[PDB]
Design a protein around this ligand. Sequence first.
Ligand SMILES: Cc1ncccc1-c1nc2c(Cl)cccc2cc1[C@H](C)Nc1ncnc2[nH]cnc12
Length: 820
Amino acid sequence: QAFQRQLTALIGYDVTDVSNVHDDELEFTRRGLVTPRMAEVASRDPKLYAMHPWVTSKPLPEYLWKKIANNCIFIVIHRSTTSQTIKVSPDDTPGAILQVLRVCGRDEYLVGETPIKNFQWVRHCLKNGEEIHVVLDTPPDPALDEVRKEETVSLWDCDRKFRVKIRGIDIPVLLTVFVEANIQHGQQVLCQRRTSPKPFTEEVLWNVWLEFSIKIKDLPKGALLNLQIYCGKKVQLLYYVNLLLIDHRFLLRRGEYVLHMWQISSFNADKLTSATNPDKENSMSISILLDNEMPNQLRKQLEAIIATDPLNPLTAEDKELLWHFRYESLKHPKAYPKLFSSVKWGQQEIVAKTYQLLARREVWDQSALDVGLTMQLLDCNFSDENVRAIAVQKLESLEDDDVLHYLLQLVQAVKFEPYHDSALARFLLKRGLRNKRIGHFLFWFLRSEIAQSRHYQQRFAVILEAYLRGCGTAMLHDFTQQVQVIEMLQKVTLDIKSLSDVSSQVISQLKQKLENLQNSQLPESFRVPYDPGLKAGALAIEKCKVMASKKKPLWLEFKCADPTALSNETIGIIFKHGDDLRQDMLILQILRIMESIWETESLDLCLLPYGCISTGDKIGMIEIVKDATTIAKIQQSTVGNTGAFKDEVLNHWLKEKSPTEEKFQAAVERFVYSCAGYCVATFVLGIGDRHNDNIMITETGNLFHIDFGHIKERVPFVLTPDFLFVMGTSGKKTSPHFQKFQDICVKAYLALRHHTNLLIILFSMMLMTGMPTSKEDIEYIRDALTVGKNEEDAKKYFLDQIEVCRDKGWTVQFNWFLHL
Ligand SMILES: Cc1ncccc1-c1nc2c(Cl)cccc2cc1[C@H](C)Nc1ncnc2[nH]cnc12
């Protein structure tokens, strides 16, 4: 039982607790997840698990090939104080041809049957212009990863109409009010019934049967009884709660329920949860009782429909066509979301035909994996397990590198699962247990939601517990260490915040508190949650500070615990309270996806998606990007504390940080690319109009936006005169670098548009699961990606945007200044 107490603290929630359930679905899931855990445990190669090689099968891009010399990769190998360099061909395997080679300063290994060109660490060095420093080391013992040993009427024979008794609602404290009861499947309301309005007192009783038109034999599995409370005095939603009509054992839900409801403040994933509100003492409750072959024009119309984006709404006509031409639609994997949205789920014979249809998915099974298409099947529009499972079926072929690219949003998509035990939850379980890097991030992503989502903490806790019981003792200790450190640091972060430029007493107290944590509480070393390779050590109390800001975040710097670390660079972590860093995580992850897209078209845009992990309610950690300052500061340094800005200061800031001409122009080139990435990426994501104290530049030219979890003459993005002066453009001219900037944006924008469907789905999912949203909010990226339009035309559009900034110059940057 002591092991369970550890799990609870690691998880941040008590999975054995049953104080907020009305059935045993959670416990059933615990027991259900035992098998796929042990299958993965018993199957993983202990030695490859222990070393967790971070590897990709993608080609090395054109931008990384043209950085090689005569098919030669230099790899410095170390012993104790040995440093002997080797000539290696890209195709050389480490655990054979290089003769375990751990990376210097990192928990990262160049091992296994893949060439060195295909290790992400090696590609990381090639990109930045660094060298491959490895250390001959003993392999880490797989015994350390050891895992603690463990231990009657049919539904389709029931033509009776479904009914639910609304006994009444009850609220301790506090105009009229009524109950709406929807049978839902996906976001689709199948059947809706309301009560009569009554006066809104602390108790309202109806004692009324709501008889629905849908038959019990017609309720599809995963149908939700969605109970909602509205008020008049033109109504308004005030509370909601859901109840699965068919439970986890395929039994029709039967009997008395007192469901504690959620309060409002709309596609928001929280609306879909089957979790009841656990705050029984303040929350509105509701009491219920359940006691129960084609023509040519048609082909072209069908093809036009199949070709539209995931946010083009299907008409009744559209759906009827897809459904009638079911089998022709089944030949086109891109049709699948629309076809399955053309299914009348409230009709048992249609669902049966849909299931027949699903048994003929040769073309789907044979199709190359499209993540975009696959993600759409995992969104809120699909509640059927068999549809959703063909989505997860395709995810199974993702190599680990790609799982990590999509992990955050795969974890978020668990929120769209009807049941706690799902093919998706088990896929994430499986892939996390097969790979320590996936498992590490799975821990934190799951934990991020467990700590601040009442709506989904129970589900995620069960999944996280199931992961933890298979990750192996080493990772348990390891995770335990990390949680203890962030709890210590979050405490210091919050305490300093209460004590409010940063005054004398603040700078005094912080450093004492850091010195007090250092001397007793803090461990020898711990893993950096956002960069599991890096192990942090002792604080550099010297270098730690608090921002002259209203949120008063902590800038912390640590020593690297790893003696074999080559640099002297500290590990920098910002701890901040006040911002919802879930939104940042999501945006930063989409920026990583955008980078991998660009990579497929051999385009680098040098984005800087810095590490960020939400650890709790409005709280978390941000990776310190070293040698960087804000653009706003670069203007204040030369111009003044509070004044509007001059065009030359950024370029002449860049100049004064660049030592040689070789490294300066590099900075300017790096900046042209960087500026282009963020102009395209922020435009697409609709977060481009930012005050320049939320844009940053490195000493080596790399522009990057920060502080995403925030967001009248406007601007599509930020391409200010100071950015344009670095390119060399005095108001209305055209430099060589600017035409190249214009060049790069266009190719980047068109590159994103080639994955339009993927981006639309990730943007939709982002809004639904991390931004508490409307259809019109979601439909921004359609316009941003100029859906339906041609290359030439989308290119004009984007150039027109580049010029909108030019027309405005400084007006919005300055209009912020006044506001702020
Ligand atoms: C580094 C910096 N330069 C100029 C202006 C502000 C900052 C800065 N200072 C901070 C302090 Cl003193 C404490 C806590 C957080 C701070 C954040 C910043 C800047 C605004 N942001 C970042 N600075 C460095 N790395 C980052 N990664 C993500 N965001 C950043």
